[PDB]
Amino acid sequence: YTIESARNIFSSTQVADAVPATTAMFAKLNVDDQLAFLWYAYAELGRTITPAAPGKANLQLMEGIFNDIKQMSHEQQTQLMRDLASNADTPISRSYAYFGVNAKLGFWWQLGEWMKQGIVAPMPAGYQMSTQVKAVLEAVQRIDQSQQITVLRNTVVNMGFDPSAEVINFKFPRASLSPQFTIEGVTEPTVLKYIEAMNADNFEAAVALFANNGALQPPFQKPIVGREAITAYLRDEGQGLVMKPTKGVSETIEDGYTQHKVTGTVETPWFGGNVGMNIAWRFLLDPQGQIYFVAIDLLASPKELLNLT
Numbered sequence: 001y002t003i004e005s006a007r008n009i010f011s012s013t014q015v016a017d018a019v020p021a022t023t024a025m026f027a028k029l030n031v032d033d034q035l036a037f038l039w040y041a042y043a044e045l046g047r048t049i050t051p052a053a054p055g056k057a058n059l060q061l062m063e064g065i066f067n068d069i070k071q072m073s074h075e076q077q078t079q080l081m082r083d084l085a086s087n088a089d090t091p092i093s094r095s096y097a098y099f100g101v102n103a104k105l106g107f108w109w110q111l112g113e114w115m116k117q118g119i120v121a122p123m124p125a126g127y128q129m130s131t132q133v134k135a136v137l138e139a140v141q142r143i144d145q146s147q148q149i150t151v152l153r154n155t156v157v158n159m160g161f162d163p164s165a166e167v168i169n170f171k172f173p174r175a176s177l178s179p180q181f182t183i184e185g186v187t188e189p190t191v192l193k194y195i196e197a198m199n200a201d202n203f204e205a206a207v208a209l210f211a212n213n214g215a216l217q218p219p220f221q222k223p224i225v226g227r228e229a230i231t232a233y234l235r236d237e238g239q240g241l242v243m244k245p246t247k248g249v250s251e252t253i254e255d256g257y258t259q260h261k262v263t264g265t266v267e268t269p270w271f272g273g274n275v276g277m278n279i280a281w282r283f284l285l286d287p288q289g290q291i292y293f294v295a296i297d298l299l300a301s302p303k304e305l306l307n308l309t
């Protein structure tokens with residue numbers, strides 16, 4: 001077995017292809033229209049769901065930058081939004097590039113609030129009734145909420161400077177009591193211990209279960225190899241996630257390796273159970289019961305939760 005061949009481990013599982021397709025569409029817009037799409041897509045989403053406050057302590061990690069953006073002309077604030085959206089090399093764009101996913105999301109969230117108060121100039125958006133942006137809007141609204149918030153996350157993860165260590169990491173309260181999940185059809189300790197570690201916010205215990213040369217493939221992303229790179233990834237994107245697998249199958253294969261497919265929902269700290277992402281986990285364990293490979297898939301539809309062999 002090789003990482004390349006373990007990527008195919010249950011090949012019938014079907015994924016939300018519309019996510020990268022819709023990001024590719026957003027990429028074809030000019031900056032004026034990328035901003036107009038962000039403003040409207042967020043306002044439209046805010047008809048059903050509003051992201052939860054990320055915390056005073058988390059947002060205090062960027063207090064310096066927030067003070068700058070407040071002691072700044074409406075014209076300066078406008079220019080910053082354009083600079084972040086256009087991938088410009090300015091001081092705050094360079095800083096933004098060292099925010100982790102949640103800090104980037106939190107940066108935008110805290111500006112949203114001050115927009116409501118007039119303390120920050122709104123989105124300086126080109127027109128949102130532009131045909132090009134109206135078409136990318138239609139594509140977003142045609143897909144489920146888990147896909148919409150994923151598209152919205154991607155466009156925000158891709159703003160500011162592109163520099164090819166010092167990443168700001170939001171931390172969040174553990175959600176609930178000891179049994180946060182129960183998996184029908186899977187008692188494999190390594191699988192259970194992974195989900196327990198993630199829900200406990202203990203990413204060292206989660207990565208401890210990986211082989212020295214093991215890998216983690218996030219949704220729509222390349223595999224991440226070895227405990228150091230996996231642990232750094234998870235210290236960013238794993239924070240505040242609650243993982244609610246409910247069913248799966250275990251299979252022994254060649255050389256005393258085992259395969260496991262587990263399905264359920266994942267809840268972001270931002271939306272809680274308002275957006276239950278339908279997720280599969282595909283694990284290849286070597287004979288020592290260690291994780292050689294695990295893929296995480298945003299599933300195509302709720303029907304995929306029941307596709308198990």
Ligand SMILES: CC1=C(/C=C/C(C)=C/C=C/C(C)=C/C=C/C=C(C)/C=C/C=C(C)/C=C/C2=C(C)C(=O)CCC2(C)C)C(C)(C)CCC1=O
Nearest residue numbers: 038039042051105108109112149150153218237268270296
């Ligand atoms: C932009 C903007 C604004 C605001 C914009 C705002 C506030 C936008 C807010 C958007 C937010 C908060 C979206 C968040 C998305 C979260 C996702 C998709 C996470 C999924 C994680 C998963 C599946 C994790 C899975 C995983 C599992 C299960 C593992 O087991 C392994 C790890 C892994 C992590 C991979 C304004 C307010 C200013 C208006 C205009 C404007 O410009």
